[PDB]
Amino acid sequence: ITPGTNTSNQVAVLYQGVNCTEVPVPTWRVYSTGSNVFQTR
Amino acid sequence: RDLICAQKFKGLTVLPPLLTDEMIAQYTSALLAGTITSGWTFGAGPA
Numbered sequence: 001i002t003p004g005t006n007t008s009n010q011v012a013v014l015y016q017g018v019n020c021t022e023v024p025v026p027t028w029r030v031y032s033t034g035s036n037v038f039q040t041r
Numbered sequence: 042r043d044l045i046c047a048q049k050f051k052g053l054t055v056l057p058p059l060l061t062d063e064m065i066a067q068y069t070s071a072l073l074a075g076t077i078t079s080g081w082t083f084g085a086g087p088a
């Protein structure tokens with residue numbers, strides 16, 4: 001999720017089909033993870 | 042396993058809709074309230 005490169009560079013990652021417990025954070029090298037997690041449907 | 046979980050292991054997924062059933066129900070309730078209490082005036086301008 002990006003609000004646009006012309007405004008800022010902060011992004012939000014939405015892992016599809018997880019439960020905030022099997023996040024990976026040669027093993028899908030870690031990206032910028034957010035400390036504010038929220039489980040959705 | 043069931044059929045839904047057996048398809049996720051083959052790459053086929055189902056994305057959830059944006060508007061849930063509760064929001065559609067609230068929209069229908071608002072439409073019914075506008076139709077009963079105002080008629081057709083809420084579709085043109087103010088109720």
Ligand SMILES: *[C@@H]1O[C@H](CO)[C@@H](O)[C@H](O)[C@H]1NC(C)=O
Pocket residue numbers: 019
């Ligand atoms: C997801 O996590 C919640 C709370 O941790 C739990 O109640 C639920 O059963 C979990 N669902 C699955 C599919 O693991």
